[PDB]
Design a protein around this ligand. Structure first.
Ligand SMILES: [Ca+2]
Ligand SMILES: [Ca+2]
Lengths: 281, 281
């Protein structure tokens, strides 16, 4: 019937990609990548950013259907594109060690830059590191990581929110005064700290729970979320600054966040700027 | 229809379902489920069977492509169907806690009984237990599990083969003299014991490595497997009984195995009979 009806995903029974209508409204063939040139990039070849991606594509909705989601490609690749041009490298990990799952329906197919960057890291996205291995060997006081990046997309709502491994990564980042970068639903991962109040008083921007309750009306999702990461984040001490979305980014000490799928470019510029200043002395 | 070109999976880039031709030869609209009749089933309400399923659908081939696989639905459901009728219940788990991934292209869409069983267990396949929790509170000397079932499908080749968690489960099963039920590629999970000579001298049937070497020739998979589970199994003590496949099964003490996607029904009968005789003593 309607272009607003969820689109069946052939690989999983009772699973759906966003409706044709929502895709035309919420995705585009090109990204708005801009100002990604850095005249004095980091050239030390040491500092890297740890990327923690979603290893699951199917998210259970309140009505039993699966939302065929995963990490948002634009939210993931724009920040990475800027950091790449800034001279930084990446290690990609998932909780299980299984492939990072992208919402391919949001990939800007006509964007040469974004597609070129994915291809650059495709072997890592497809065969990522298992977070437990990273925790056991690449963190600590002498880590080569200058920060951690947790991309958005509803895929970040699975596993990451209550993973004891993610908790360890976040505590490490805070303990070693490392950058924590995330946007949209990515901050849901912060809930991994459980009852630990290490994020008390922090200000961030994140996708509004209010909007998650509305997007299903046009078939962006085949149902509604079974919980609210925003209210949960507020429960552990976070202050959510944005009522709506406009690509706004915020920096609270070393916590850098973006508000939605509109903040990829701005977050990339902010992170690149922040990390570059950090490496210079 | 006769097309032997792997079929692109829309949900994942460079991922492929079996070719239309291989599907017409290796899958059917109906299963050969039969003889699932046990006049005096187990009604003690205690003994259950733990199912360790595949949580990943995308398997990396030797040529960079992803085989869109997972657990084989017929191999999974026929054994369960017989055991269900025999009066046993199931607990379904995956390593990550993520949903069990089925090779839906092998699901017999016109098999009313098979689809009826899936309906009964869909909530468990879709929101399975996390194996780590199972090991922590449901095993031990007083477990309610009478056996473990590890279904086939190439998805069994991911994570399970070198999982310390699967190792614990196998060590427990052998120590507590529990049934271990598997077929086709499921035995690859037995490799999880690593270097524990636990299965030394056991006889099993499993999918022939040499057949795996040939199915890609008709587009069943988009490439070839990066390793051979059969040789690895022999390397840890197993005597592989079958050279080819015919859907036969073998019982060596409490180790029950099927040889391929043709062994689902026979394995259900073998397992149901062994477990029923067990509980009847
Ligand atoms: Ca989104
Ligand atoms: Ca098969």
């Amino acid at each position: 019937m309607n272009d607003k009806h969820p689109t069946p995903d052939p690989a999983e029974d009772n699973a759906f990609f966003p409706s044709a209508y929502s895709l035309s409204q919420f995705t585009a063939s090109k990204s708005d990548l801009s100002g990604a040139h850095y005249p004095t990039p980091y050239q030390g070849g040491r500092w890297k950013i740890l990327v923690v991606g979603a290893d699951e594509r199917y998210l259970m909705m309140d009505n039993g259907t699966f939302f065929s989601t995963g990490n948002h490609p634009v939210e993931t690749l724009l920040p990475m594109y800027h950091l790449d041009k800034a001279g930084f490298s990446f290690d990609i990990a998932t909780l299980s060690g299984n492939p990072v799952k992208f919402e391919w329906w949001a990939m800007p197919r006509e964007d040469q830059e974004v597609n070129g960057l994915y291809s650059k890291y495709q072997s890592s996205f497809r065969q990522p590191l298992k977070l437990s291995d990273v925790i056991e060997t690449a963190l600590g006081e002498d880590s080569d990581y200058i920060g951690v990046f947790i991309p958005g997309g509803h895929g970040a709502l699975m596993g990451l929110p209550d993973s004891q491994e993610v908790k360890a990564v976040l505590q490490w980042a805070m303990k070693q005064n490392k950058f924590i970068i995330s946007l949209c639903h990515g901050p849901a991962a912060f809930l991994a700290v459980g009852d630990d109040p290490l994020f008390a008083g922090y200000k961030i921007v994140a996708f509004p729970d209010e909007m998650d309750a509305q997007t299903p009306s046009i078939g962006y999702m085949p149902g509604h979320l079974t919980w609210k990461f925003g209210e949960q984040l507020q429960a552990i001490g976070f202050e959510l600054l944005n009522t709506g979305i406009s690509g706004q980014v915020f920096q609270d000490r070393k916590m850098l966040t973006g508000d939605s799928p509109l903040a990829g470019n701005a977050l990339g510029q902010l992170a690149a700027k922040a990390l570059l200043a950090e490496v210079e002395q």
